Design an enzyme around this catalytic site. Sequence first.
Site: not given
Lengths: 438, 441
Positions: B215, B284, B348
């Site tokens: 991406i 990132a 996450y």
Amino acid sequence: PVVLERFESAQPVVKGAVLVGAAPSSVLSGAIAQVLSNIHTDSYVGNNVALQQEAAKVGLNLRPFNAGDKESKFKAVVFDASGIQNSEQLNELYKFFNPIARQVATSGRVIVIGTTPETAKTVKQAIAQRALEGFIKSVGKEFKKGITAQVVYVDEGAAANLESTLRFLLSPRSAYVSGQVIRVSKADVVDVDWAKPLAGKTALVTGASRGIGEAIAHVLARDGAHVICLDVPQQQADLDRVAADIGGSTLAIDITAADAGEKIKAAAAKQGGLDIIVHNAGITRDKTLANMKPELWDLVININLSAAERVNDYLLENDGLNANGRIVCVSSISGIAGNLGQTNYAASKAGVIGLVKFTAPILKNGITINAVAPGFIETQMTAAIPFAIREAGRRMNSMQQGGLPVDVAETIAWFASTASTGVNGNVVRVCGQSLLGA
Amino acid sequence: LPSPVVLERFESAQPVVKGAVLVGAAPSSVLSGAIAQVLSNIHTDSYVGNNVALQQEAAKVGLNLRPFNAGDKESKFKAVVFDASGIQNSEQLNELYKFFNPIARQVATSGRVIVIGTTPETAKTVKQAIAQRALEGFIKSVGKEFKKGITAQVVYVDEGAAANLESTLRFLLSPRSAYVSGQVIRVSKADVVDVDWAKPLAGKTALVTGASRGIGEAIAHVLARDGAHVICLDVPQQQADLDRVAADIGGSTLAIDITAADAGEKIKAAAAKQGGLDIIVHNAGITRDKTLANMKPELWDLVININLSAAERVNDYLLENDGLNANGRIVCVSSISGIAGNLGQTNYAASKAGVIGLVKFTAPILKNGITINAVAPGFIETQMTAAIPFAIREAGRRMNSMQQGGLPVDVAETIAWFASTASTGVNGNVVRVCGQSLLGA
């Protein structure tokens, strides 16, 4: 799937042990420790000197828990994350929860208590406190065993208004509430009989003759309230049956009629005025927008939203709710997430969320407004749902099962509690953490 | 089960909309002038029903609305745009029915449903706030119902910010927004700046983290296509891929670890060679999926560091050291799991929910026209997709209104819309790029 533990009697609030932890420099630990002392539960703590001292200062004997013990089970694990000051300190979540992640009991509770991000004094703390919701939603999907996971945000300075919410989440009453964020704000602390937290109050429940409304009426009456059961005259027979079962009364009118608010106030005058109103009346008329008739759009908006606005407006402007009163609305997951065939219903139920959000700032006299937003609830009419949606709704949540009418009723009753003075403007899903959302 | 339709995506700067646009408005609406000016600017075939006030407001701004015969059930519209700002209460929500029901089968494949209202928190009456809030329930249901690859959005304009709508309405009208559906976008008041809509990043310098692949590489391509000079940032281990991407788009490279304590220093030093930094995209990020009971301490820490704390340190440096030029842009990348949670992703999801907080609580303190926004991608097909099981990857493909996974370019386009020199009044937004995934909060 798991059989969920549900409410049996007022004591004990929690069956089993509770483990409490806190991040360094937390400010909510005294308040948490007081509730734990109040409910007389076996409470344990790890190697946290400040937390042990905070609990001792309010009279709670915390048994130390051996970090080497991987066998003891805890019914609830409660973590004061208010001390987390920046994103680096989010590893306080790992430090507490990783060692006990297999030791939460069946039907257990993971409860993280933080500072409302909007009220945090620094941007870094607001960011870290916001991160807590991501953590608890993942816990709610991962721990299984019918365990629920919540984050309670306490506005900076509102530690004294947390008890009723902590009790609800610790208890089996909250069995089908998981993945949710609850905000506690500053308010007067009022006396309350925790075993009868609606003692001396009068409540009115619309759509009360059957279904979820009937279950709402039972729980409010159990908690002490005199319940006025409201439905259309055609349901007078079921209304009398419900009111007799719960020792309440009946008011058989169309809630959408222009004079509904006036008739509600009149009927409540005989019982000392109205304390609680639960807008449960509501319908679906599921059609694709292309096939929907105009009157079916209007009907759904009217019953589900505009009728509650009219009644609320009347009661609030004409002295129709007593001090420390309560308005509880019923939204829906489809109001939050949308659904095919429900452009009218979702619009109405999203409107209900707005009714709560924009009414709560203008309320006076200690009155609060909140909503429940049920997911998939098993009713006697549930087999009338097309099988595809039906089985999906039943399975696509962390509990892998549909909820019960009593699960919605308990959450409404927690909002209605005389002690829930600092619970205002909340919309709490009762969905077993359904995958659906916004 | 059916197979998905092909979504139209960006081919060239014009036309913005291929096909006809039907416009409507509720009585007493206040955004129709601004909408009509946009439709004028993009030179699109625009139609209208029997709404005299709407036709007259559009005539004021030079847009000729052609009457659309209300008996015509056959004409197709690439986009239907409804000004709901005139809906004053819940009873008036039937204005939505009056406009959308007659044309509910006439939106073209890959089409657009766009409802434009007044930000509920800025509405002058409680009753209007409630009605405007209701529009989100409506459009989310439309997004799940109309099929055919059609997207549905509600854009809220703060009372008084009508002149700031243009870049958002262009993005939504256009194929660039192919994989954005079900979302709420807030437009706030700000200065209007000149822009070349064909090159909305002309003369600007952008830095993209994690730019060497995936991406990040797609972001670098779209920003360069819009006129930006792109500094591609990744770890020195990816120098060859970095050089490949920078050469393909005409950019430059900066090989550093974004977590390094001096990363913001070196970013500012690098952008000095091109006139200072205008745009930074924090792309990132890593996953280290493990159940919490199995996760190692370093694997919690690493995910929080790369995905959240590192962006915080760089933002802090650039904002405290004039490292971002006026009308600059910070674009972050959250995730559906940051919104909705996921098994195996306590680290996450915490980090990506934190990114939402980074956006929400930085936006009010920005100065000099700088904005901060985030995208929250759903299921996007990449090369890191083969890691997840084919079964779980089938779930992400199907469980959205598009019945397919997205492409990296769909994420990049939404980021490019945020970064647009013209998007001065787009600040504090988190916009999912998920094809209206079923998952949420």
